[PDB]
Each structure stands twice: as C-alpha cells, then as structure tokens.
Paper text:
Among them, the bacterial protein FtsK is unusual in that it translocates on double-stranded DNA and is also the fastest known translocase. FtsK is an essential part of the bacterial cell division machinery, recruiting downstream factors through its N-terminal transmembrane domain. Its C-terminal cytoplasmic domain, which follows an often very long linker domain, can be subdivided into three modules: α, β, and γ, with β adopting the RecA-fold that contains the ATPase activity. Upon recognition by the γ module of one direction-determining sequence in the genome, named KOPS (FtsK-orienting polar sequences), α and β oligomerize as a homo-hexameric ring around double-stranded DNA (dsDNA) (forming FtsKαβ-dsDNA). To this end, we solved by electron cryo-microscopy (cryo-EM) structures of FtsKαβ from Pseudomonas aeruginosa bound to dsDNA.
Residue numbers in the entry:
A (entry chain A): 541 to 570, 582 to 638
B (entry chain B): 314 to 570, 582 to 720
C (entry chain C): 314 to 570, 583 to 721
D (entry chain D): 443 to 540
Write the structure that this text describes.
DNA sequence: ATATATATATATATATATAT
DNA sequence: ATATATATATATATATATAT
C-alpha cells in the first residue's frame, strides 16, 4: 500500500494522507484512506518462546526484524541472556 | 542524451565549518598535552572533513607511535571531543594522524561528488560514486573491476541511499546502450521508483515469485553472451566490444555467429538479499551462485544488499566470488567480521558512513557516503522516462 | 622446431620509479631512522623487485630481530611508504630483510620470464614459468615433480592467464612427441582458443559427457602405461623413456611385451566447479584415481577451480594434490581452503599468487605472468603451421 | 638405520618394536628409507626364515622389488585387494597363534 | 536437511619475563 | 619496584566438514 502511493516510509505516508485530507478527500486505495498505526510487537521472555515453539516462529521474528522498520512494525524482545542459543 | 548533472540538488553551503583560529587553537593544545605526556611532537597541517578532522602531527626523532596510540584516550579527555582514534601510518607521508570527530557533523551532497572532475572523466560505462573520503576527496570506484559488490549494514545505517547513489552513478554516465539494470526488491518499496526507465530490461521484480524468472534470464543471457564470445576468440566483454568497434571503424562490420553491436554491461542489483532467501529459498541460491561463478567475462556484475551477510544468508560459494565489500555501521564486532573480515565497521557513526574494502587490502578506505534525497531520484527517473522508451525484453 | 621466442611481446619500457640513487637515498634514510630508535644497522644490498623491494640489512652484533620487527609501523611512516614488512630469515646469509612496496606495480610480461638461464637449461618435458619472484628472479617449476596442481582464486584474480602461461611454457619447449595435452574447459572461452594444435589428444572438451569420457580414457591410458612399464622393469616414465631410447639407438628396436618413446600427458581442467556440477558423480572416482597414483605414468592434472571446498573437490582428491596456487581469495577462510594458511587474502590481485611448493609450508610468493589474447593466438598459429591435429578419436 | 649425530650406526631389530610408522612429507627420504630397511632385511636373512608383503597404493613404487624369493604375494598395487591381503594376514596371525 | 566436532578470532583473567 | 610484552586457560561466535 505504500509502494502504490509513492511514499517510502510510514511517517511519509501519514504526512501524505494528512495533506490530502487538508486539501479535501483522502486517497483512494488500490475505500477511503486514513492514517496507519505503529504496530509494536512485544515478545516477553524471548528465550522460552523458542523452546516451546522453536523453529516455527524463529524466521518470522527474523523477517520482522529485517524488513519491518519502514512499515511501522517494531519489536521489543525481552530475554535473560540472548546468546546465539537463544537468539 | 545523458541528463544534466544539475538535475540534482545544488551544493549545500558549509555548516559552521571550523574557522582556522579554532583549528590552530586545538593544534596548539594538542602539542601542549602531548608534551605533558613526554612525547615531543609538532602539528604540521590540519585537514578538515565532513565528519572527522585529521590533525596531521609529526613525532620527534625516536618517538614510537605506540606512545601515542596508548594516549588516544587522554587526548580526547584533554580536548572537548568524544573520543580520538590515531592513524599509526599515513600512506605517503612521515606524519602520524590524530582524528577528531566534528561537533557539527555535516552532510555529503551527491552533486558534490558527481560534478568533481573524477566522475566527469572516469572512462567506464559503469562507475560508482560512493562519496567523499575523510579529507574530502571524492571516492569513485569502477564496478567492472570489482567485479561484484556486497553492501551490508544494520537497519538504519543507510544501505539504500547507498544503492540509490550507486544507481544514479550508473545513470548519469551510461546510455541505455551501455548499461542495463536488473533490479530486484523484496521490500516492494525501495527500487520500485526506477520503474519505467529505459535502462531496465524487465520490470522491477516486486512479487517474489518472479525473482527466479529474472535470474534464470540472467543466466540465459550470460550463456548467450558466453557462447557469442566463444565464437570469436575473445575472452571477455572489453575485447568483444573492441573487436566490434574495430570492425565498424574499418568499414566492415562483423556478423552474428544479422549484425553485431556493442553489448551493454548488465548490473543485477539485488536489494535485501536476506528476505529474498527467506521467501524464495534454494530456487534462487543456485542462480546467484552461478552468476557469481561466472558472468564476470560476460559483463554481468552483481550488486547485493544484506543485513549481516553470513552462511545463514549468503552461502560460502556466493560470498567468496564477491571481492569488494562495502560495510555500513553494524551492531556488534562479530557481525563486522562477516563483511570486512576485520572488525572496523563498528565505530562508524551511521547515517551513511561506510568502510569501502577494496579487493585485497587490509586497510578499508573509509568513505562518508552520499545522501540522495528521493526528490533527486524521482526527478532523474522522470528525466529518463522521456529521454528513452520503456524497454522490456518480453521473453523474460 | 620449437617456435622462436620472438612470437612473444617484448619487454616493456617502464617509468622505473626507484632509480638507483632513489634506492641509495632510501637505504640511508633507513639506516638513520633505525639508528634513531636504538638499533645500529648497516644496509648492504638492495633487491628491487616488480612490486616490492627487499632492503637486506646487516644488524650490528647484539641487535635481536624483534627489536627491528617491532619497529615496522614506525619505519612505515619514516620511509613514507605504505607498510614495512620485516623478514626475519634470508636463507644462507646473516642479513635481515625489509620489504618496501613500490609506488607502482610493474607488469610482468611473459617474454621476460623465458629469457632466463633457469628455463633454457631446464631439462624436463613440462616446465612451468609461473612468473617473477619478489626478488625479480624467474620462477621455473617442474610440473612433472609437483606433480599435480590446484589453481584457485576469486573471479577476476588471474587464473586463466596463469594457466595460459603454463600451457605456453609447455608449448615453447616440448614437441608433440614429448608432451601431449588434454583440455577440459566447461566455460568455453579460456581454452577453446587451443583448437587443433599438434599436441592435443582430444578436442577442447565442452560436452561434459565427453569430459567424463576423456577422463575415463585417461585412467585407461594410465593403467596401460603401468602395464607397459611393469612388463619391462623400469620404475617410472623417465627410466622407461631412457631405456627405450638406448635400445633404439643401440640397434635393438624393442617390441611391446616396435616400441616408441611415450609423451607426458597434461590434463588441464579449467573451472573444475562446473564439470563437477554437471557430471560430478561420474568423475569423482576418476580424478581421485588419477591424482592418487598417476605420477610414474606421467598423467598430470591442472585443476583450476574458484574455491576448493569439499562440495566441489572431495577431500580425497584435494588431499593428493599437495602443490597449490592461490590467486587473491577475498576472505581468509578461502585461503584456508586453498592453502592451509592466511596470506592469500592480502594479494594485490592481478597476477599475484602464493605458489606453495610440495615439501614445505612456506608459500613462495610469485608475481604472475601475462599472456594476452593475440600473444597466444600467434603462438597457436605458428605452432599449428608445423603439425597436424592428430587427435585420438576413441577418447570421446 | 643410518647413523646418529655421534657418527655411530643405529641398527635396531624390527621384532622388538614390533611395529613401525614412517611418515614425513615429500622429498625427505621416505622411499630411500624403506629401501634401506628392506636391504637390511635382505643382507642378513635367507628366504627360508623371512618373508614379505608389499602393498603400495602408488603403483610401481615398490615394484623395484619383484622376483625376490621371499615375496609371499606380488606387489599389491590396487585398493580393493589390499584389505583382502590384510584379512589373509589376520588369518595367518590366528593360525600362527593356534 | 539437520545435529556435532574442529579450527579461529576475540575478549577477559593470570602469571612470568623484560624495559625505565 | 613498576609499567608493558608474551604465553596460556576459558568462554562466545562463526564457517567448514562430517555424520544420522
Ligand atoms: N549519505 C547520507 N547522508 C546523510 N544522511 C543520510 C545518508 N544516508 C542516509 N541518511 C539518513 O539516514 C536515514 C536512514 O537511511 P536508510 O537509507 O533509510 O537506511 P536503510 O538502508 O533504509 O536501512 P534499512 O535496512 O533499509 S531499514 C535516511 O532516511 C536519511 O535521513
Ligand atoms: N600478470 C598480469 N598482469 C596484469 N593483469 C593481469 C595479469 N594476470 C592477469 N591479469 C588480469 O586478470 C584478468 C584475467 O584473469 P582471468 O583468468 O580472466 O580471471 P579468472 O581467474 O578466469 O576468473 P574466472 O572465475 O575464470 S571469471 C584480466 O583483467 C587481466 O588483465
Ligand atoms: Mg534501506
Ligand atoms: Mg578462468
């Protein structure tokens, strides 16, 4: 949705929708376009989630960490000793 | 023809650059403090820079540099600076270096690098304008000599404004008949603004099921060229183009083993290689390893972009055939040793700092990047969408 | 019969940066600076090489080398050069070395290597003119006593200019009745120019099925030569050739249990990685049985890979090829793959190598030669004019 | 075995070791060493009291020894039959204890 | 395909063994 | 006597190379 609007990050997208509503109607979506929140994933004890679940989750956390910064999805990993065994 | 260098933003006026009085005061204070520690020295000159100023100081007869490298912290304490790093050996002079981080760290425009006489005269179809070095000289390295490239860093370092700087280096020098790009983006968002330019020979690969198709085509083009060269006794692309140019200027053009032309230099810019490998998997790894193991002769150069390139992301076969590493700042030191093989890329101040590591030199050429605002890239793409038609080799 | 060495491009005229006075001044500036740090040292000779310059120094009695060694990063800035590198032992003398890099890397052209007394006096069917040593001395290594060779290095590091150099070292000295040639070049550029020369046993293989066939025939010819030698009493091919020569010249032309002097085969394999990627599992055992035992019979291998990892070269194959040559590996683990040391990481790229002699572990650094395209075309032409491509059809 | 650094010779009975391990990289003296050991076996013992088995995966290396009257099997040069000859040596050990 | 074993680089802590 | 220089042990992290 951000590549369809020509904007590179979430803050720019909110600036764009705010300006377009300053000038009247919001954007049309490839309904009515609006402002997006800033998702905050909070994985407490990220040392037992990779012992109950293990392989399944791991690459999803990896992709969130790699790609999700311009999309507003942030991550707060709470652990006790993030060695490579854990993270 | 080629767009004007003035389509970018104009040079940014200097930002509270240290007047010679303050530099001279800091030089005198440096000499006094180093005399307090029993090391007779003499500041010869002072080189200001965009980030760090280089106090070119000279020891006395019989002063081992270690007696300065150990004092690297007390020199920062006696001054008002955050920290000091000494350059034990300056390549070409007798002096020893004392690097001071500026308080008002300014920025590096891109038109400042391009309009320099080195870009304007660099006789390569595929140059790269990385930015200014410490002292302020523009660093501009050919790509056909690397012959590949591994841009790397952490989230927020600037490894995308770097790829955009490299691409706008490609564009202001090369017509569509001299360099044709193959852009691939998993983020769907970074390289999706070059769509429409004539240089591209396929849409900017956005859906990650077509990256395999684009790279199959890259290997196909590689083989086609690699046999077309075989049928003419040549061993690279430079010799091939020299052959066809000699044929044309001698009035008799050669024949396709139709009529042969000069071949462009394919640059396969693969952004965010890690998420690529985490979506597509081993479908692509084969083709990337193939393009690495080959395509240097066929003139197909490969620019990557990763976060901590490791065997978890880039196999040992791909990462071996990529000589030139450019590392922005990274989190740890164990991480910087995966890119540069030496942990220097941790002290980088981010926001476009890098350690250009040429192919086989223990000392990385520290470059301060080049900021390319999206206004510049949009204007360049709008200039290209008019100076040439949107080309796409459809059998891809 | 052998073509004249005038077919090679002659020595070039260079800028000759270090004039003898510029070396004398530097030797004196070296003695003075060493005296400033407390070591009394008298330079006695200089060896201006192509890329570096070993200042031999006789330190006064009581001056340990470590006193000179720990002053490297200081002599570096004192002599204004990039980096000093003290060599503790010069074999056979009492002098320490100091290897100053030059400001300009001189090209080593191939006519300069064959004009030595080592090469012309060399009595072997297969000599290899690798290039100039760091002391300018030509390096002439005998293929028949390494015996096998494992060239490897990153893309653009000068391997198939250091295999053409070896094959031209073979051509300029040995007749087809002295050394034949099998050529397996999957990447059909860098050996396909050796078409129809009187040396080849089979055409320049590009069909990997035919490559497996050629290696099968090579094993068969190997074991046939073992039968032939065992049925006469000789120990290896050299004694066999001398014995058949003496029998034929002594009026007793023998018959096979008439008879003729056998050649020495040189199985060249350019870019072995692709041949393993296609027909690997049919060729693993063939090469593991060639490299293992084909010394006495006279079937040698030139396996020019890009990274000798186990996936490409099984440990059994790589354990029987003890003589290796590394061309500028990017990381340091790759040096651990080709060599079992470092060193190969910090090579200046074009040409340079670290030829590792069999018995020792010290890599004798060698600056490679340079045989261009036409400089090889003319050799192939003038050698094809004096013979017919008498292939052996049943190899494929 | 040659001389020591004192000039005097060092001859040692093999049936006190009772097993030996030559090693060392190329161009050192390994082949000449093996040949000296074998000639030591020769100039002292008639075939009626000593025998040999030579197995060299590098062919023709030990084939200078062919026709010796105490050469229980010919020069084993391949890889497949080496283990077979060694199995026979195991069986000979077993019957020699029995 | 996915767990081990090895070698390496790097960082601390600890003594000895030389410079000043 | 006291600041460095060199060797060693322990723990982490990574890349290869083996085995299931
Ligand atoms: N050369 C530069 N000079 C000055 N500021 C820069 C420079 N390069 C980047 N910046 C600033 O730093 C910010 C971060 O750079 P980015 O290009 O977004 O990093 P990045 O490559 O996107 O990292 P990820 O992995 O994609 S989140 C930019 O938005 C600019 O504000
Ligand atoms: N002695 C030399 N002096 C100068 N340039 C040299 C020398 N030897 C090699 N080169 C350069 O090295 C390149 C040729 O090396 P190549 O053999 O084509 O590379 P390579 O080893 O074949 O890599 P791949 O994997 O086969 S693509 C050319 O750019 C030559 O100019
Ligand atoms: Mg980015
Ligand atoms: Mg090659």
């Amino acid at each position: 949705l951000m590549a369809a609007m020509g904007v590179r990050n979430l803050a720019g997208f909110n600036r764009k929708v705010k300006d377009a509503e300053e000038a009247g109607t919001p954007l049309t979506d490839p309904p009515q376009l609006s402002t997006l929140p800033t998702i905050v994933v909070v994985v407490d004890e990220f040392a037992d989630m990779m012992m109950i679940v293990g392989k399944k989750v791991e690459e999803l956390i990896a992709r969130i960490a790699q790609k999700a910064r311009a999309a507003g999805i942030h991550l707060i990993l709470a652990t006790q000793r993030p060695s490579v065994d854990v993270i | 023809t080629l767009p004007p260098l003035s389509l970018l933003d104009p040079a940014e006026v200097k930002q509270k650059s240290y007047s010679p009085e303050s530099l001279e005061a800091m030089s005198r204070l440096l000499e006094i403090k180093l005399k307090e520690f029993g090391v007779e020295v003499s500041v010869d000159s002072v080189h200001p820079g965009p980030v760090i100023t280089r106090f070119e100081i000279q020891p006395a007869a019989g002063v081992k540099v270690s007696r300065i490298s150990n004092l690297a912290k007390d020199l920062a304490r006696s001054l008002a600076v955050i920290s000091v790093r000494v350059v034990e050996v300056i390549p070409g002079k007798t002096t020893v270096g004392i690097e001071i981080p500026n308080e008002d760290r300014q920025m590096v425009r891109f038109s400042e690098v391009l309009s320099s006489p080195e870009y304007d005269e660099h006789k390569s179809t595929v140059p790269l304008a990385l930015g200014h070095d410490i002292g302020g000289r523009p660093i501009i390295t050919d790509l056909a000599k690397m012959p590949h490239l591994l841009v790397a860093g952490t989230t927020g370092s600037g490894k995308s404004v770097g790829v955009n700087a490299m691409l706008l280096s490609i564009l202001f020098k090369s017509t569509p008949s001299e360099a044709r790009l193959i852009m691939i983006d998993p983020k769907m968002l970074e390289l999706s603004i070059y769509e429409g330019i004539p240089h591209l020979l396929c849409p900017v690969v956005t859906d990650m099921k077509e990256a395999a198709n684009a790279l199959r085509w890259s290997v196909a083009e590689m083989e086609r060229r690699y046999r077309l060269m075989a049928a003419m006794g040549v061993r690279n692309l430079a010799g091939f183009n020299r052959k066809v140019k000699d044929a044309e200027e001698a009035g008799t053009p050669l024949t396709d083993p139709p009529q042969l032309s000069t071949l462009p230099t394919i640059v396969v810019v693969v952004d965010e290689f890690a998420d690529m490998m985490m979506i597509v998997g081993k479908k692509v790894e084969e083709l990337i390893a193939r393009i690495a193991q080959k395509a240097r002769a066929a003139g197909i150069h490969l620019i990557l972009a990763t976060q901590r390139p490791s065997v978890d992301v880039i196999t040992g076969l791909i990462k071996a055939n990529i000589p030139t590493r450019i590392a922005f700042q990274v989190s740890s030191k164990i991480d910087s040793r995966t890119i540069l093989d030496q942990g220097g890329a941790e002290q980088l101040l981010g926001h476009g700092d890098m350690l250009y590591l040429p192919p086989g030199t223990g000392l990385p050429i520290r470059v301060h990047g080049a900021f390319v605002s999206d206004d510049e890239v949009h204007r360049v793409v709008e200039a290209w969408k008019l100076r040439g038609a949107p080309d796409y080799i459809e059998d891809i």
